[PDB]
Amino acid sequence: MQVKPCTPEFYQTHFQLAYRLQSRPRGLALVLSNVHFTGEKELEFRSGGDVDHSTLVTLFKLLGYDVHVLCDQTAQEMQEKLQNFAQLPAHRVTDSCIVALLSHGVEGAIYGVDGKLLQLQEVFQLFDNANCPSLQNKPKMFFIQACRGDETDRGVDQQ
Amino acid sequence: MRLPTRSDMICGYACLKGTAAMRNTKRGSWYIEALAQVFSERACDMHVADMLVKVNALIKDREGYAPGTEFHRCKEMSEYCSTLCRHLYLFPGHPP
């Protein structure tokens, strides 16, 4: 699940200092999850990725977004379909955008199911002021659930 | 009127540069679990950057349970990076 509602008083006291965010839908949201990998590079099946995917789809719907979904895409498919999503005319009449990417990754890049990498800088560029004029000056949220290396953090004791 | 090439984005990362993000095979990833918990409860009265701080607080306290493996008692730290230029409130359910 439940998204607690904003009060009218809260909106009245905060709308002047915030991004404009009142459109219906609030924005388009894209949830892209890769769980099953089949390239030359062995990448482990992402058990529990199913739970993440449905949690975000539910969350973003409940927050008033029109949710688009993609599952198990190659690096090339991800770039193409993200670019297509960024280019949708529907962004012209919404106030914001959400993109969530869930996969295996390395520093600065995420894996497609083919074990090839898409650079995250190229992903953000698709939505930037140059390439995505429909989203200029509108808030764009990205959530990236992927490893950024293979160092495990053993933690430290509190001193 | 001119804009920088990139602005008004906030990006939440499950882990820090060089490190692993953690996922429970049953409950899903630590970061997504925390994100949904916080946003569902607090989107009503907290802006997105401030909610991602609450997510960070939840992640910092979590610890890996996976005895006999590399990950037992492991830690994670999430982060966010922001080019936002004002508060981002999602105003859920307004106007009624």
Binding site: D150 | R23, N24, W30, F71
Partner: peptide
Amino acid sequence: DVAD
């Protein structure tokens, strides 16, 4: 718990 496992790594992504």
